[PDB]
Amino acid sequence: KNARVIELIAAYRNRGHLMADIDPLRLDNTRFRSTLWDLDREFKQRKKLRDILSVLRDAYCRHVGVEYTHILEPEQQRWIQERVETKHDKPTVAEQKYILSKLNAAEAFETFLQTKYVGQKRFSLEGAETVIPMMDAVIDQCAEHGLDEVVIAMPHRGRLNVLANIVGKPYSQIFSEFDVKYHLGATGTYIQMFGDNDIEVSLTANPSHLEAVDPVLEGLVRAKQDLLDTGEEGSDNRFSVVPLMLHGDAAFAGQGVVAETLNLALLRGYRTGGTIHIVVNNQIGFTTAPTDSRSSEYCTDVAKMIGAPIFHVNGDDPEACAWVARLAVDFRQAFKKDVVIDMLCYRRRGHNEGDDPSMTQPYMYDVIDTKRGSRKAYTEALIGRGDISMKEAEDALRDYQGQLERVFNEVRELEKHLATAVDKAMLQRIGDAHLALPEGFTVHPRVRPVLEKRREMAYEGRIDWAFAELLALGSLIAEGKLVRLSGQDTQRGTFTQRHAVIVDRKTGEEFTPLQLLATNPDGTPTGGKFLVYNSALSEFAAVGFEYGYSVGNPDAMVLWEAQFGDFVNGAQSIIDEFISSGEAKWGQLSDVVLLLPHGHEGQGPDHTSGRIERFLQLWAEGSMTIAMPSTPANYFHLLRRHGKDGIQRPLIVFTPKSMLRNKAAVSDIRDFTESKFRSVLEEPMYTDGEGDRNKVTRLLLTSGKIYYELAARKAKENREDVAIVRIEQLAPLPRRRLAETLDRYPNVKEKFWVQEEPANQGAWPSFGLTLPEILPDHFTGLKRISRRAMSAPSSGSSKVHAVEQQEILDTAFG
Amino acid sequence: DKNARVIELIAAYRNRGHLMADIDPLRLDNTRFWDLDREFKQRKKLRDILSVLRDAYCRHVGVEYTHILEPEQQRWIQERVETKHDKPTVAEQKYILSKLNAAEAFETFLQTKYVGQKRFSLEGAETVIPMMDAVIDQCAEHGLDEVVIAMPHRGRLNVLANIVGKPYSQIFSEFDVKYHLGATGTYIQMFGDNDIEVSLTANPSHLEAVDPVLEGLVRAKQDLLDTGEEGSDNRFSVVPLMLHGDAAFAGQGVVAETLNLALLRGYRTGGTIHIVVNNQIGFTTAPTDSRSSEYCTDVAKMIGAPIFHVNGDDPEACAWVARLAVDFRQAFKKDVVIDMLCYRRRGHNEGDDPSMTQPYMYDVIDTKRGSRKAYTEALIGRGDISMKEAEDALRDYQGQLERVFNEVRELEKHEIEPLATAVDKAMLQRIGDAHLALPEGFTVHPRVRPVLEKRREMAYEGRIDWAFAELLALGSLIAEGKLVRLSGQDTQRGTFTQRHAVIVDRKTGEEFTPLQLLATNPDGTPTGGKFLVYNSALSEFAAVGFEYGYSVGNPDAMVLWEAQFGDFVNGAQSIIDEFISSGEAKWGQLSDVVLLLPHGHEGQGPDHTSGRIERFLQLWAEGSMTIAMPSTPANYFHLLRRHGKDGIQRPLIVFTPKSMLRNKAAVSDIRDFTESKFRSVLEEPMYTDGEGDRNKVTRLLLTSGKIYYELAARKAKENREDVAIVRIEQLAPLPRRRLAETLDRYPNVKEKFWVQEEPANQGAWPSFGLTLPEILPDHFTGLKRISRRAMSAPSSGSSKVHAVEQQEILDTAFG
């Protein structure tokens, strides 16, 4: 008998959520449909079976379905158990009237939006208004914990309602010259109704691509947390900036970026101390039923991936919705982990203007047609329970009518009316930092020569690409800049070239040489910091996060590195929807850097190209900077210009692979100490040597590592009749610098654009069309030397690659 | 009190026993790890109850199943794991050893013979070979038809040799491309009398991107064998066997998207067997930087799949778990995940000393001896084999090592390498009548009834709109015996409420598919055709991957995927770049998949305007894809029929309309379907059928899409006989000959303009502006552009700015 009780308690805790009254439509009729003497007997604390069962039914089988026994941490399971398995105190009349007022403001907003304007049906929150008192309870509970800010990400459903009743934006600002408003960012201040605290509330900008903003929100919050010295990279572990992420039920289950973003939740380089997720689960996705949208019982089942607690709540019970919201914030504060709230509701109207939803879902919409909304239901529930009188119920209808009148009246009144060069001592300091090892630290025998070579390069020259990058980042940290660098195996570097973090051979303790530059020689801090991480095996969420991080902190130097540029197409939605276009669409600025290893080396179509042609196609004046530097010093100056120009614009860099170790691809100390970024580069024989520009009859225009191969052939045959000019900055085209350079070669009879990439790829599709237009006196008659047009970035054979590479060089000097 | 503690102890082992199981062959985490003779209620002693629990849940197998919501599935697993298992026979143990011998010999050979083969090494993970063998042998025991494998490149040539059964002469012929190619073979049971087909699908370097492609390929083969969801039997006799790495399984979103398809009526394959080669590393990255969960397989809890964590140094437990996984898949038609914990013996690649970034792990790996030597030693200790049998096993390894060196040596010396689309009027009338041939007692929605009546009207009288022309093309192909699979977001009804391929009973919710009536001939016999139309999940990457895979699985099928708006297809960029546009040239893998991308400047913003024509034209190379933007319903009909009947496997990219679906000028006559063909270049009807004079034309406007109707309306309003509008219907391959012949009919043309709605850096202009003056210098030298200004987004966010820009384009064209 005692064993049956223990099995019954476990059954309610594990599967009680399957029997809970969570659906306000009660569509599934089989949900509930599919000894007595022992009830008065006491069982081991000592309690009667009737009391054990009543607590279990109220906690797990009422309007809240709790999923938590999947959580591997026993202390988290106990925390939930203790707060859910108790006789809860009824809310005060003032708290109930406050919830009803939020519902009044929410429904008053929806009734206005549909009546006043045309084409607003797709943004309707009708049937889901209970999300407003729920979000209000989340933010109020965050203010109760004394937190600094709540940052919201959401799709467009009920967005202007969120702006008005959550962010607190006035109607004059919302409906000012009223489309793009459903995708813009916003900021406001939330003031507690019954408390004495206030909290900042912001909304991030987003495209129509559902869930794509999810990792952008995480990076944005993480950037704000690092600035406030809270969380993982802060003195306190309060994570005082809270991500509040809203979702639709079909999008939460079908979009892969959801799983990728959940996967970042506890990572040292990406954690935000837990996200509060709210799914507006209207049990439909346009015309699609949940059975065609997901292969699981709940739309939130993906969140079990990180052992997050899940709360399924009845959208027609705003008291349960507000209580679950406050419990979610308390769980997040206690364990610094994600909490998911599944709000079961409905979509009152069609998906859009041309939709009669009974065409595709007749059963659901015959049931929806009998529904009266949460505001009217909750008013009737408070009357029946005896919580409010008829006068209080009438004053609530008067509150609703007044909120409806105020928005119509306020909208009516609105309708009536810099050097990048550093000193030699700076290079030497960064060099010395690589040998300034902590006491008792054991360097790996293969890492030690890299550290010694860096000190050698800093004092004697012949600086390679990898060190030049760290010289740029190190000098920025010394000047007080925050530098965040991440990507797949980025601490060591894919080509074993970076060693930004070195690992103790005996203890595994990490040492970051560039972090020593965050302290001045006098011992005071510079204000700078180096945050370098190995990313998860993700492109979409990682690129999204880094973009979001640069929005959250515009003063930060943010760099994301692809393993190979070929894998950045996994993040195409972030590149297309945020990086390349965010400024023009929403006035949202980003200084994010994308490092894309690129080059034809015979390693196949997925280890050759970062697709230069695609980034050049996306580019428009002032949207991005696109570069492919050929020297370590020019890359150093490119990174320093980017971090110090005071302009928030993304930078796309096509970085080297074998050229990292090319002995000809090295720079002198003077290139770092007495120079600047050069958008156009000439051969050193004309600028520093004894070369004669007047002997040149053939001009080769190129970019990247193929320069060294072209220069080697020129030197081998003593070809004084041929000159090689490098275009370092691909976008914006350096028109003036290119014109001035070409004017120094007056006897040129033919010009050729030389590239490794196929004819339909690289810089030729854009340069071949733009150069004869922007500079007709210089590029009329410009011809192409490249690989043949291909459906892939390269051949799969290293043998075919070698033949094609030699064919390019022979054509250029033929 | 004592009896209650036993019940709580049983639950604890079932729920959390996997956290205490000896699953790591490296044992890196050191913190991981009188009532006995008393009988408890069947009646058994506590020592016997605890021994069953420890052996089942805390030995070399970690079982996760109490998260499964189905009680019958929890019960099935419980009953098979909580029993005194019969020890395998000496012959079965020897067979597992022979597979370890063959796998290890292969790996020693690859690293001694060739250069640059370190990154593909299966050393420390060789137990995946007897595990995969057990999966396929168990599938053959169930009398199944085929196992289709998808995997990354680690151990791929080893899989080809010891799983697929390819010979060394075929594997090492002209020996990196082989690490991505597809393969086919036959598996013959060692102890059984059954055989089963085994295939390997082609894939790019993009980890996990092949996952929905495999599901698609399997589903197409299942449909062909009349097995599964669209079959007569519930066997789902084609089994997907999907291999993964631990870092990629946790980090790539396409994994969750593909798991989300597992039980969907349009996408289910009756369960996938997943094998994660969990070497507890991702290049230089430790699992703590790769995932926010206890296990790399925790994403699979999303669909309530059972998960088995198994010690890679115990090949008996690995083989047993593999067979149990196949039995679970056969019983419940749902995914099973096997997490094989192992290690990576060598560096990730040639330039890696793995002790630089993971010194603790590789000091422990340096003391490891491999699963082959370990299992041989384990069989001696247990007394299962003798020293003579152990020496015979070592001789078997040597024999296998010699054979691969000899066969490749023998190879090196021998080898020297180091149609009309028009239908009859009766076909049109039949498709029209099918829309009104409703089942008995069916109640049509009052707003759907006029659409069905209008389709019968169009079929007999003409003025056929875009939406009906599409169904006329698909319907006629089904009548000719072709399988037609159409899917995408809200594709049954259509995003713009225009398709109604499936209609729903107003009173019962019963679905009716009018085009399915064309799968039966007028005499009552089947045509061999079928219409498979589905609403997809809210995915682009997995759904596009699936449809590409489906066309590979069945080359005779007509496969169409429809984007809600073309603007969202960039969510599937990896599939477009790595499979659709390039699969043929890279691997010789052909696909006839169709992508339908709603496109057009209508003032609905930058995410409801463009399918990015410029990106598809940039990806295109001769013979890779067909790219079209039809302007008329009849030309779209002929485009789809040419595509399905040309006998060529090549992807088709179609930029489809939105408001042009209801443009009353964008309709076609019956004769356009019955006495015509696809026209890559279209002239104005006034010159081909009317009284228009081509000799009066001095200005030629070249265009594509719906803007034609706006240009034609302005020409008619101002009676501009001096201006002609020529449409390029087929954007790629450029119809050079038809374009040249068309332009030659206008001898008094002094200026030519390419007119487009898209910004200057978008649409067809970036490629056409560079290609047309090169391929046709006598016709397009001096060709000028009329378009929107170059933009960082596909359009402005304002419908007001859109309207001003649209009018500006028309005024420039006639200015």
Ligand SMILES: Cc1ncc(C[n+]2csc(CCOP(=O)(O)OP(=O)(O)O)c2C)c(N)n1
């Ligand atoms: C990535 C992406 N694919 C497709 C669309 C088109 N789309 C807009 S609304 C919708 C359905 C959304 O369903 P759900 O997530 O349940 O949200 P609801 O509209 O029901 O609030 C779709 C597919 C989109 N905006 N983003």
Ligand SMILES: Cc1ncc(C[n+]2csc(CCOP(=O)(O)OP(=O)(O)O)c2C)c(N)n1
């Ligand atoms: C989508 C993608 N991003 C990046 C890479 C580069 N890459 C190749 S191997 C590797 C690590 C794979 O780790 P895991 O999944 O554990 O497999 P393992 O190599 O350990 O077998 C990475 C990131 C890739 N091939 N695909």
Ligand SMILES: CCOP(=O)(O)C(=O)CCC(=O)O
């Ligand atoms: C018609 C189906 O798509 P829509 O609802 O337009 C859609 O993409 C909603 C999301 C948005 O536009 O912000």
Ligand SMILES: CCOP(=O)(O)C(=O)CCC(=O)O
């Ligand atoms: C250096 C890390 O990347 P690689 O291992 O080259 C890689 O992409 C492995 C997957 C493949 O190439 O098939």
Ligand SMILES: [Ca+2]
């Ligand atoms: Ca900048």
Ligand SMILES: [Ca+2]
């Ligand atoms: Ca074809």
Ligand SMILES: [Mg+2]
């Ligand atoms: Mg929904």
Ligand SMILES: [Mg+2]
């Ligand atoms: Mg691995």
